[PDB]
């Protein structure tokens, strides 16, 4: 502090690291898995989840039929993330250490 | 701040006084250490130019084209609004480079070109062509093996000096095993990586690759030491010093 | 390479037909590596930093002998020939104590540096089997693009890996539909995507564009037309219909 | 100064840390060389992002 | 002088734990985020999407 | 090595004496430190031989 210990500023500001997140989030939605393996290729998100189910052994027909149900389960799941992180502050203790 | 009438001097969590009260007049005076920081020199390589830009950390411009940044005072550089790819890292998301009558400029580090992806219900992009690219990845494997002798190093050619080393016990005997263990680990890294099989396979005399040329990566028997054409450049590009 | 393309989602039919053009792209890619390493010497800086790391550590340990470490002189013969044996021991104590702290500091750094080398050793041993030896579906471990084959190369105090990746380049805007409605039951693709250029709907691969007429062999009937959202109407070709004349 | 380069060395060791930390920032957060953005019309297929 | 050695010694050791976590984070973004991971329980319990 | 007329004692990068000059009969002599190399024992197990 006052004894000569210098705190060096980070190379990238909190804003820049947030832009990288926005780039990844925006990419996965429109481009699915393509942007990481090559040029950006737009794909409809409805078909993205369809082909992600075929990779785990689930026929895509489940999505189109249950798309309405999968819409409630997902949205309800994201809501629990906001309530958990807001209510429970110890989940980030790994970083606080 | 207000000190207690009976407490003249203050202290922080580190037991260092941050403020004091005038022994004569009654006042609260905070003690702020004098300005100090590291001296950073941002200059291009000697081959490019001799231009130099001094940078200060955690302090504004005091001593001293004098510009100020988030990391501190920066002298000898020019501020540019156009953001380009990072060259010389500085801090607070700022990079410096030597460009155009050329000097050193200070610009904000760019995250790369902007690319917008159009999204639509029926909009989909199916690649109509492909391109084969070969990426190179380099990783360290084995580290230079060095065995130091604490008996000769500590006391050179000295019997009396060495006698005092016995009073320290295993300190010398212990440091010898620490370095020996590192030398043994160096051999295990090459065996678990370089050779993944117990057999040696050689290419046939008649090589038909189906239109591909592997001669670059294939070993050349004409050379005295068998190696691939690519390995030859690696040995030369990677460099008495040990005699001393 | 025919099977290697099947693991990345590309039909092997593209290799046999396009293998002639791959010879120019593959051979030309290898030539660029030889010119980059010879002309540009900064690509090997990863390994150079390892040698220089030990060089600065060795010279520093040797330069400590020149330091007095609180002793009158840094030479042992000078203190032994001047001060008394008991007095020299007092000065020798500062010499050994100063050298021990310098020797332990070197050994401590070697153990830390050795741990960092072992961390990269496991990665080098992992890339050999997954990239070079075998084929892994993991992305950007073997380098950008779908991994195909890796060629290991020996390097002083290290190793260099040559990875062959499949990167798509040209693409075009297409109109795709989630399902096709023909007889009243939703038709779903077995492999590939539904693409249409504005005339007729086609079934093509995701990684490669290969127009193919919709048939019962490339799709399977599931559900109905009133469930899937965004379903479109089209005709499904049946190979058994024209064969009825025989 | 009689104790040698210990002062210099202890600074270089910590200097490396500050450099390695910046590497972890780039090797992790940024996996791409481009910035992606979504169109103004957002159709997520029922999900709320 | 020994106090600095103790401090620098701990920072170098702790740096190894952070650098190991950074490589782990970079690995997850590749398998989990960018692509689809077929590994078991690497992206978390259940089949990863 | 040819030392200048006024130069006598040389030194290497390690500051040790590389060569000297005999003060009586002037000549240069290269000093090669003695006592180099270790002693390693290669033997099978005690129960073997």
UniProtKB/Swiss-Prot annotation, chain C:
Specify where the region named Heptad repeat 1 lies, as residue ranges.
19-69
Question: Which residues are in coiled coils?
Answer: 48-92
Q: Got any disulfides in this one, which pairs?
A: 131-142, 181-225
Outcome of mutating residue 126 to I: In strain: Gamma/P.1
List all annotated glycosylation positions: 173, 197, 233
Its domain of life?
Answer: Viruses
Changing residue 191 to K has the effect of:
In strain: Theta/P.3
Function, in words: Subunit of the fusion protein that is processed upon entry into the host cell. Mediates fusion of the virion and cellular membranes by functioning as a class I viral fusion protein. Contains a viral fusion peptide that is unmasked after S2 cleavage. This cleavage can occur at the cell membrane by host TMPRSS2 or during endocytosis by host CSTL. In either case, this triggers an extensive and irreversible conformational change that leads to fusion of the viral envelope with the cellular cytoplasmic membrane, releasing viral genomic RNA into the host cell cytoplasm.
- Name of the featured protein: Spike protein S2'
Q: Which organism is it from?
A: Severe acute respiratory syndrome coronavirus 2
The uppermost taxa in this organism's lineage are: Viruses, Riboviria, Orthornavirae, Pisuviricota, Pisoniviricetes
Swiss-Prot record, chain D:
Residues carrying covalently attached carbohydrate according to the record: 48
Per its UniProt entry, which superkingdom is the organism in? Viruses
Outcome of residue 43 to Y? In strain: 19B/501Y, Omicron/BA.1, Omicron/BA.2, Omicron/BA.2.12.1, Omicron/BA.2.75, Omicron/BA.4, Omicron/BA.5, Omicron/BQ.1.1, Omicron/XBB.1.5, Omicron/EG.5.1
Q: What does this protein do?
A: Precursor of the fusion protein processed in the biosynthesis of the S protein and the formation of virus particle. Mediates fusion of the virion and cellular membranes by functioning as a class I viral fusion protein. Contains two viral fusion peptides that are unmasked after cleavage. The S2/S2' cleavage occurs during virus entry at the cell membrane by host TMPRSS2 or during endocytosis by host CSTL.
Write down what this protein is called: Spike protein S2
What organism does the UniProt record list as the source? Severe acute respiratory syndrome coronavirus 2 (2019-nCoV)
Q: What is the lineage of its organism?
A: Viruses, Riboviria, Orthornavirae, Pisuviricota, Pisoniviricetes
Specify first residue, last residue and whole-protein length for the fragment.
754 to 802 of 1273
């Amino acid at each position: 502090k006052f004894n000569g210990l210098t705190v060096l500023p980070p190379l990238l500001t909190d804003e820049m690291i947030a832009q990288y997140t926005s780039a990844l989030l925006a990419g996965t939605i429109t481009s699915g898995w393509t942007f990481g393996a090559g040029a950006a290729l737009q794909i409809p998100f409805a078909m993205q989840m369809a082909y992600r189910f075929n990779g785990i052994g689930v026929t895509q027909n489940v999505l189109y039929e249950n798309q309405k149900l999968i819409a409630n389960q997902f949205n309800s799941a994201i809501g629990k993330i906001q309530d958990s992180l807001s209510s429970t502050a110890s989940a980030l203790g790994k970083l606080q250490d | 701040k207000k000190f207690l009438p009976f407490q003249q001097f203050g202290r922080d969590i580190a037991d260092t006084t941050d403020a004091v009260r005038d022994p004569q007049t009654l006042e609260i005076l905070d003690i702020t250490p004098c300005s100090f920081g590291g001296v950073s020199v941002i200059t291009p390589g000697t081959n490019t130019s001799n231009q130099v830009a001094v940078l200060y950390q955690g302090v504004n411009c005091t001593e001293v084209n004098v510009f100020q940044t988030r990391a501190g005072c920066l002298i000898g550089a020019e501020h540019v609004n156009n953001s380009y790819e990072c060259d010389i890292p500085i801090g607070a998301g700022i990079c410096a480079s030597y460009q155009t009558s050329q000097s050193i400029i200070a610009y904000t580090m760019s995250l790369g070109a902007e690319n917008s992806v159009a999204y639509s219900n029926n909009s989909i992009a199916i690649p109509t062509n492909f391109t084969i690219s070969v990426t190179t990845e380099i990783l360290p494997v084995s580290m230079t093996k060095t065995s130091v002798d604490c008996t000769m190093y500590i006391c050179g050619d000295s019997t009396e000096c060495s006698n005092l080393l016995l009073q320290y016990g295993s300190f010398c005997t212990q440091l010898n095993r620490a370095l020996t263990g590192i030398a043994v680990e160096q051999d295990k890294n090459t065996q678990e990586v370089f050779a993944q099989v117990k057999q040696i396979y050689k290419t046939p005399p008649i090589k038909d690759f189906g239109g591909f040329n592997f001669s670059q990566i294939l070993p050349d028997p004409s050379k005295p030491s068998k190696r691939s054409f690519i390995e030859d450049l690696l040995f030369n590009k990677v460099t008495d010093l040990i005699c001393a | 390479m025919a099977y290697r393309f099947n693991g990345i989602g590309v039909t092997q039919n593209v290799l046999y037909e396009n293998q002639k053009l791959i010879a120019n792209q593959f051979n030309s890619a290898i030539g660029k590596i030889q010119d980059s390493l010879s002309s540009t010497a900064s690509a090997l800086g990863k390994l150079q930093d390892v040698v220089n790391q030990n060089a600065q550590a060795l010279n520093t340990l040797v330069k400590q002998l020149s330091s007095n470490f609180g002793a009158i002189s840094s030479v042992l013969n000078d203190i032994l020939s001047r001060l008394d044996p008991p007095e020299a021991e007092v000065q020798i104590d500062r010499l050994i104590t100063g050298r021990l702290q310098s020797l332990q500091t070197y050994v401590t750094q070697q153990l830390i540096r050795a741990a960092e080398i072992r961390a990269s050793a496991n990665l080098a041993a992992t890339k050999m089997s997954e990239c070079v030896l075998g084929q892994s579906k993991r992305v950007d471990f073997c380098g950008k693009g779908y991994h195909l084959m890796s060629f290991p190369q020996s390097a002083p105090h290290g190793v260099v890996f040559l990875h062959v990746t499949y990167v798509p380049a040209q693409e075009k805007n297409f109109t795709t539909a989630p399902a096709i409605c023909h007889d009243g039951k939703a038709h779903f693709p077995r492999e590939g995507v539904f693409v249409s250029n504005g005339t007729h709907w086609f079934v093509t691969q995701r990684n490669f564009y290969e127009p193919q007429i919709i048939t019962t062999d490339n799709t399977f009937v599931s559900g109905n037309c009133d469930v899937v959202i965004g379903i479109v109407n089209n005709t499904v070709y049946d190979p058994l219909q024209p064969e009825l004349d025989s």
